RNA sequence: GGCGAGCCCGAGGGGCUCUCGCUUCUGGCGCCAAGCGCCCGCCCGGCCGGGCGCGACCCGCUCCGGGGACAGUGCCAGGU
RNA sequence: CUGUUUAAUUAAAACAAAGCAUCGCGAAGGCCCGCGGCGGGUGUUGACGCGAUGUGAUUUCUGCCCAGUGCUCUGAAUGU
RNA sequence: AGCGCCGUUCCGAAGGGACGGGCGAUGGCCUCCGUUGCCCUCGGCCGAUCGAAAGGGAGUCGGGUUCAGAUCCCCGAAUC
Ligand SMILES: [Mg+2]
Ligand SMILES: [Mg+2]
Ligand SMILES: [Mg+2]
Ligand SMILES: [Mg+2]
Ligand SMILES: [Mg+2]
């Protein structure tokens with residue numbers, strides 16, 4: 001039959017990111033000599049708003065120790081930082097809110113954000129607004145470090161990758177309800193075309209595996225396995241359980 | 253005088269003296285481009301029995317295709 | 321003395337900028353540069369067969385200089401003096417009506433086919449085998465063949481230097497077959513030294529494997545772990 | 555030789571100047587668009603005639619491959635008269651219409667009577 | 672390398688065993704070298720304009736890290 | 752609730768909507784496109800995110816059943 | 832298999848430019864200047880190129896003129 005809505009995301013025709021008004025990708029400095037054997041001062045000029053992101057962007061200018069030129073980068077603004085605050089980066093940088101330093105230097109229990117999976121990919125984990133990771137379980141031999149992620153998962157990562165100390169500013173963004181369709185339209189128009197949200201039972205049988213019949217009923221079990229083909233995975237995908245929760249996660 | 257020795261060394265191409273050179277040449281040719289020019293043949297006996305004569309005009313290309 | 325002050329600069333982290341250093345091991349080299357460098361490093365890392373580890377085990381430079389001083393006056397003629405000898409011998413035989421003015425011309429033989437034929441027919445007194453042949457399969461049969469036919473062979477480093485004694489880019493093989501009376505003793509001494517070096521130790525080189533050398537960072541890592549193991553034992 | 559930069563690029567080689575052994579067409583192609591081929595037809599209509607008295611300006615029909623400089627040079631090399639400015643339009647039949655204003659020292663009526671219009 | 676610490680022997684000193692360091696109140700500035708030691712054509716033991724090294728340690732065989740005989744790729748076979 | 756919908760027979764009690772929830776995914780990943788490449792969309796993105804779903808503001812509520820069909824987890828402990 | 836397809840910085844030796852100095856040659860009034868060749872030194876392009884007659888984009892306005900032109904043609908007055 002007809003190609004479902006779930007398969008049309010991969011075409012990239014009208015489902016791309018509305019990426020023109022975004023100011024730039026929020027990464028750290030690439031790793032160099034000064035960020036592994038010392039520290040270097042940088043000056044935050046301002047903080048701005050990246051559209052599609054509720055977290056504020058921070059425009060921190062640096063000084064290049066090799067050729068005389070002031071390099072401008074784009075950090076994720078931590079909570080409580082202000083313009084003119086000297087952001088310090090490197091290995092032996094003193095631990096304050098806004099200073100990025102490798103996780104082997106910081107002690108356990110340090111609440112950080114914008115950390116890295118692999119050492120040297122300029123910040124991947126914990127980048128949404130108001131989220132943080134918990135650093136525990138350092139190891140002298142076999143240089144690893146456990147981090148508690150915002151989903152509750154404990155991931156063992158390397159001990160050389162960097163992380164800015166603090167939480168991401170803009171926390172509590174999901175406290176207010178959207179309260180009408182208009183703010184949802186403007187929010188998703190700012191982010192990307194992800195809002196033709198039509199009910200799969202309400203749509204046609206030839207366009208979705210659930211819809212049709214004289215009554216709006218699903219008819220088939222919505223728990224559909226991970227080994228399903230493309231276009232079959234509708235509803236619950238590989239659901240180990242369903243219904244109301246009991247406990248917190250109960251998953252090791 | 254030599255090309256029969258080159259052929260007989262090339263025939264049993266599973267032996268330890270040949271498979272090292274074969275692995276080194278496969279790495280060297282895989283890390284090159286897909287279609288390019290080799291300035292001289294690497295199998296002189298096989299090239300000469302296919303028709304290579306060492307004079308101005310005969311050009312050896314090295315080319316890489318994908319199996320399957 | 322009037323003003324002439326000193327203005328020192330401190331080149332640490334977080335202060336005045338770094339000077340232009342050598343930057344040799346950190347420049348992004350092109351494709352073929354990286355290919356030849358990691359090709360040499362790949363031959364150094366991986367285990368080579370015992371028929372190609374004979375290369376880099378070659379003759380020392382004093383005996384190679386003696387060999388070049390012997391081979392300098394058995395040089396094959398180039399095109400200019402070849403045509404000169406042809407025209408001069410033709411004019412002398414046309415002037416004198418002579419039959420056989422030349423008794424025996426001494427000249428070495430080059431080329432792998434010619435040298436292989438001469439060692440199979442036992443006409444070669446000495447074999448010079450070049451090192452820098454990039455298909456090694458063209459060369460690998462020659463040492464065992466010279467050993468089983470009893471002709472002494474010497475591995476030498478540099479095929480360009482062996483081509484410049486034959487007036488060509490590559491020569492790859494030099495066969496000493498004919499020697500004069502003033503050179504027979506020197507060639508006998510050279511053949512004695514080469515049979516001492518190569519043919520008497522042919523059963524030694526054929527058994528030994530070459531290569532199997534790790535990189536110096538990993539060697540220093542293993543040495544640091546060995547010093548830590550000695551600290552644990554003591 | 556110390557390579558301070560971490561990027562290796564092309565050396566400035568010696569690009570050879572082109573010096574061919576033989577010419578490719580044995581002769582220069584002659585100028586088809588010369589002074590007798592640029593300015594083709596003088597226009598003798600009512601408004602183009604009125605421009606001679608009221609404008610001190612001649613009206614010509616020109617091939618479309620010419621410009622103001624070539625029209626000005628063609629007039630100065632054929633009629634030996636000075637040119638103030640040339641206003642060119644494209645007449646919709648396919649030709650160019652050129653209004654050539656002359657110097658105040660010259661007389662457009664006298665030039666028109668000498669050329670025959 | 673001591674303007675530094677260390678654990679001991681210990682008279683000066685020894686380095687069994689180890690850490691690198693020369694930027695943390697400030698919305699400033701920082702590049703195209705100062706100095707030193709040599710080498711040249713010039714003014715009788717003077718003056719102009721240049722080149723090298725130290726400043727900026729030496730060597731090495733991967734640009735540096737993270738995986739790594741796994742993942743993937745090609746073919747065959749069984750499920751769905 | 753405002754909005755949208757069968758242009759050329761329907762304007763709705765239909766669709767959408769904020770809210771309520773559920774499931775998959777920590778990037779060698781989840782959902783997909785592609786005949787092909789470690790090619791692409793999400794991704795200038797990192798669980799307050801992305802993707803797929805049921806219900807449809809607020810108040811009060813979310814009864815009982817895993818027998819069946821699904822989904823998921825586990826032990827080469829054991830049949831095929 | 833293939834007309835070709837993917838991709839726009841990814842796996843690229845992807846700048847032919849220029850200040851200053853030195854050496855050589857030529858030309859012009861060899862007074863004094865201008866070119867050409869070589870050497871030293873400098874030089875992120877976010878990568879050729881296209882893409883708006885409503886986006887960005889320096890600078891013209893007044894009067895008169897024909898049956899049909901108008902900030903365009905004539906006069907006068909300005910600017911890049
Ligand atoms: Mg809530
Ligand atoms: Mg919804
Ligand atoms: Mg809906
Ligand atoms: Mg169906
Ligand atoms: Mg050739």
Ligand SMILES: [Mg+2]
Nearest residue numbers: 733735736737
């Ligand atoms: Mg590696």
Ligand SMILES: [Mg+2]
Nearest residue numbers: 142737738739
């Ligand atoms: Mg490992």
Ligand SMILES: [Mg+2]
Nearest residue numbers: 757760761762
């Ligand atoms: Mg109706």
Ligand SMILES: [Mg+2]
Nearest residue numbers: 770771807808
């Ligand atoms: Mg409700």
Ligand SMILES: [Mg+2]
Nearest residue numbers: 776778780781
């Ligand atoms: Mg993914």
Ligand SMILES: [Mg+2]
Nearest residue numbers: 243813814815
């Ligand atoms: Mg119920």
Ligand SMILES: [Mg+2]
Nearest residue numbers: 817818819821
């Ligand atoms: Mg059960």
Ligand SMILES: [Mg+2]
Nearest residue numbers: 880881882883
């Ligand atoms: Mg354009």
Ligand SMILES: [Mg+2]
Nearest residue numbers: 897899900901
């Ligand atoms: Mg009009």
Ligand SMILES: [Mg+2]
Nearest residue numbers: 893894901902
């Ligand atoms: Mg007007």
